[PDB]
Homo-oligomer: 332 residues x 2
């Protein structure tokens, strides 16, 4: 009956050691901070606890891409080969032509093997060289985390800077997100939560080293209060420099130019799923071997929901939807 | 690259003996009639071939319910108990209160086993244990619309078959469309097949009268074309049927939605706003499968009917819609 019941109940059901949730509706915001950030050392999860964003990193990457487009430095229809010259990929008999848009919207065709290759700690172009596409570029929407790693390399090539520096200079600094960072690699982050991989029970895993190339697709780190700032930025675009406002509108534009299933006509935007049903409802989950998270926005009602958890859990990916139901009709 | 390629490709993939498809866009309509209604006797699929509509039936039942509502004889909020006094259902410890809307929108909580059981309805479902409290969740159960058949009969005082004919099939001019009373021979009915390992006939089994409203309506390609055109073009339709039709497409928003599904259920239709309104339903009996989809903004109407049960046929309307929408699939 109570939101706090819903969230607490789902946390126990998911067996996550720490859960952090923030929910805002019509300018009223409640926080839910639960559990321990490190089971063995008994360190309680707090507002300062840092969580890997997994695939929720893609919205930061996509927004930067659209900032560059807004400023005229890049175009969606640009051939990928200009920014990643050495990257050759093949469809059937003949090397395939690919655009920046194909990675933005997951219409590239990159094989499923390319995730466990990009997570492995060669530059991305040589890392994906002589790959075989699952389909013709543009033909279908297939989700592949590696697509946004390709976009990281684009951002560096065009910028002439590192991904971390762009993220900070373009997004984190101007927005005031002081605990959010695109990690360079294995170097330690203070206040960070330990990550767990479920089954049979939650044993620690965090330690495995993080591939630099995969950061833009899966390795941005953040906190609940910074994610709150991120949400409020997307909900309240005004008071932001015209460039960012326009890049944000364009970021939420879904690619309609793909086949849609009978039960699913949702589109993918620049690191977001866009759903018109009881919408606009804009969302994305994150799943990493040892972290999981979700975010959902329903601007028409100024609704913004984010959940961050130190364990990989399919329940966490459904959690933002459950909260949204409770807000929409008092039921979940 | 060609619609004809798409449909024919999908028919080979699905291994359906007969497939009939009709597609209309911007008042241009193409028909695709393939295969044999009966494999053994080599009887070719033809415009007159009759196919079971499975769950497609539900839109006929739902529209009739909405016709009764429009006339004032019925209301969504009515207690089911008034029409089916004998049918008493329980949730947890104690008996649970059910409305007409619960069956219309599949928020009743009827257990899964009931389908195989419906294959009077109230004595049939007496003592049933609800999966959840009425209204709490959307859970599709074919039997929900069988309850609505019994409601239509009790309100009308007529049989389900007579109402469907008098209210819908006769006025709309659908000659070959009928709600089957009990097992009895239908002239032109295609034989039904069950896949696997290779599809042999499943024809013999007898049809439960109680289940007709949910999955037992029979029809033809040209009649389904008339049905589609009636939903797409409602002018020249009596005011009551027009209003019933608008109300039939109103989805029930009062249920929890999954992260990847925000689609609503209407009165025997799924209502999708994405690249929509896009209204669809699929039918799947042991030995028949079918689909239908409408995208009115573009006067688009698609129907497929097949004499074998196939998950591919359920996706076939969406493939065609993709082809129409973006020339790809
Ligand atoms: B991403 O690949 O980490 C990802 C994980 C879980 C859900 C979604 N949508 C993306
Ligand atoms: B119905 O239960 O026969 C049915 C079958 C297949 C799909 C849908 N939507 C309903």
């Amino acid at each position: 009956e109570r939101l706090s019941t819903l969230i607490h109940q789902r946390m126990q059901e998911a067996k996550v050691p720490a859960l952090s949730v923030s929910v805002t509706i019509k300018g009223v915001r409640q926080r839910f901070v639960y559990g321990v950030a490190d089971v063995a050392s008994q360190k309680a999860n707090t507002l300062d606890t840092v969580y890997e964003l997994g695939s929720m990193s893609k919205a930061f990457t996509g927004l930067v891409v659209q900032i560059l487009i807004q400023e005229g430095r890049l175009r969606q229809g640009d051939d990928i080969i200009t920014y990643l010259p050495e990257m050759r990929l093949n469809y059937q008999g003949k090397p395939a032509s690919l655009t920046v848009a194909d990675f933005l919207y997951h219409t590239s065709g990159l094989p499923f093997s390319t995730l466990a290759r990009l997570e492995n700690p060669s530059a991305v172009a040589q890392q994906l060289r002589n790959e075989n596409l699952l389909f013709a570029p543009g033909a279908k929407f297939s989700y592949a985390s590696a697509n946004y790693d390709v976009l990281g390399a684009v951002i560096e090539n065009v910028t002439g800077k590192t991904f971390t520096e762009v993220i900070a200079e373009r997004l984190t600094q101007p927005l005031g997100m002081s605990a959010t960072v695109a990690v360079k690699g294995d170097e330690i982050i203070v206040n960070k939560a330990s990550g767990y991989k479920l089954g049979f029970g939650k044993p620690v895993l965090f330690h495995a080293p993080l591939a630099r190339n995969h950061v833009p697709a899966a390795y941005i780190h953040s906190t609940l209060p910074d994610m709150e700032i991120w949400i409020d930025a997307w909900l309240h675009r005004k008071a932001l420099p015209a460039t960012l406002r326009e890049a944000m509108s364009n970021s939420w534009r879904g690619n309609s130019d793909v086949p849609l299933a009978a039960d699913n006509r949702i589109l993918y935007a620049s690191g977001w799923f866009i759903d018109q049903n009881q919408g606009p409802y804009i969302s994305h989950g994150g799943q990493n071997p040892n972290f999981s998270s979700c975010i959902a926005l329903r601007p028409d009602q100024q609704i913004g929901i984010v959940a961050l958890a130190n364990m990989n859990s399919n329940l966490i990916l459904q959690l933002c939807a459950d909260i949204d139901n409770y807000l929409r009709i008092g039921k979940y």
